[PDB]
Design a protein around this ligand. Structure first.
Ligand SMILES: Cc1cc(CN(C)C)ccc1-c1cnc(NCc2c(F)ccc3c2CCO3)n2cc(C#N)nc12
Length: 360
């Protein structure tokens, strides 16, 4: 029951590739979201009567930078929100959302960064996925690279998406090699690495911080999709992943009754629990998103149509779909974002337009 209440367009006329509401905003503060596109990050505030108030932007010094992704966290000691952005240059920037100052940056990836994700229980643990075939886990409190997830048995082509499970114990990643790979970060090795990353103070020691080199996933499959897998999210112990085949697939590793934490790296079976089809979304680089409670799933297509699946049903394949269109919204929707209370849905487009849908 969403209604389109407003729209606007950014003056660069370049694609907006990412949008994220700040779910770490304090009580009583207005709902804020960020857009990324061109070499720009922009913050907007949502107000009554559909108003989208423009606040302030961060413009990268490199006019050739192209931001692909962003994610919110908060500064661990001060509680003030932080915004991480990254894109074609392969550089993570940490932005102060109040002043839009770049506080610090992380270099290391060999090519573009395609997605950023923060650990669900630890606001300092930032996951990056890169065109260089690797994932990196960063501790943005001590400014340390904790681990590199790669190798010959890592991804063999550009990594496009990844996601932490609910408790932050494991990561699922996906990309251009058609594969989805599980990486457990609750192993004794990775837990110890995270602890050491917090005890590292370069002014109190002579050593560099040693990163972990993780070369072997804990599960891998190429049997879900037959093309680029450009978005992946956990839904409990299940996985939602999409390709460019007009399909979000709900699946799990192993057979039907196999526990996710009993899965071994040699597991060769998967179980398909359903498929959410849609129309006209066969270009690469389109994300679906879920609300905070994971009751709803949203995806835009390449002609401006929005699909919303109600996941509050007993089984994945029973999901109920509703569609949202506007006669003036005809450009490809790259990503969407629900506000934390799920009352607002924002969609961003290849023509730099922004569309606001309010639950009425
Ligand atoms: C730079 C770019 C140009 C175009 C063509 N113009 C005309 C529209 C299409 C696509 C990308 C493009 C977009 N988004 C990423 N990444 C981020 C990413 C993703 F990884 C997976 C899904 C997803 C996104 C954004 C929205 O969902 N890109 C990466 C490269 C390269 N190389 N090109 C692009």
């Amino acid at each position: 029951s969403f209604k389109c209440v407003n729209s606007l367009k950014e003056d660069h006329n370049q694609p907006l590739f990412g949008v994220q509401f700040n779910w770490h905003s304090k009580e009583g503060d207005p709902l804020v979201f960020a857009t990324v596109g061109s070499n720009r990050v922009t913050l907007y505030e949502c107000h009554s009567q559909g108003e989208i108030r423009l606040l302030q932007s961060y413009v990268d010094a490199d006019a050739d930078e192209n931001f692909y992704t962003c994610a919110w966290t908060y500064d661990s000691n001060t509680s003030h929100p932080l915004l991480a952005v990254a894109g074609s240059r392969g550089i993570i920037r940490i932005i102060n959302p109040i002043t839009m100052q770049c506080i610090k940056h992380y270099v290391g990836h060999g090519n573009a960064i395609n997605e950023l994700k923060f650990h669900p229980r630890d606001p300092n643990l930032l996951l990056s996925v890169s065109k260089d075939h690797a994932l990196r886990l960063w501790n943005i409190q001590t400014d340390t690279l904790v681990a590199i997830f790669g190798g010959v048995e890592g991804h063999r082509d550009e990594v496009l998406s990844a996601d932490y499970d609910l408790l932050g114990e494991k990561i699922m990643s996906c990309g251009m090699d058609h594969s989805l790979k599980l990486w457990r970060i609750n192993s004794k090795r990775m837990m110890n690495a995270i602890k050491e990353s917090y005890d590292y103070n370069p002014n109190k020691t002579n050593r560099p911080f040693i990163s972990q080199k993780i070369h072997f996933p804990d599960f891998s499959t190429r049997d879900i999709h037959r093309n680029y897998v450009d978005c992946v999210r956990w839904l409990g112990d299940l996985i939602l992943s999409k390709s460019c085949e007009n399909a979000i697939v709900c699946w799990k590793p192993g057979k039907m009754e196999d526990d996710i934490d009993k899965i071994k790296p040699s597991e060769s079976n998967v179980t398909i629990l359903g498929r959410f089809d849609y129309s006209q979304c066969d270009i690469w680089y389109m994300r679906f998103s879920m609300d905070f409670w994971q009751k709803m799933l949203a995806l835009g297509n390449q002609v401006g149509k929005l699909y919303v699946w109600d996941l509050e049903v007993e089984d994945p394949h029973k999901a109920k779909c509703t569609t949202l269109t506007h006669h003036k919204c005809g450009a490809a929707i790259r990503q969407t974002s629900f506000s934390r209370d799920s009352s607002i849905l924002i969609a961003v487009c290849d023509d730099a337009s922004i569309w606001r849908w309010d639950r009425l």
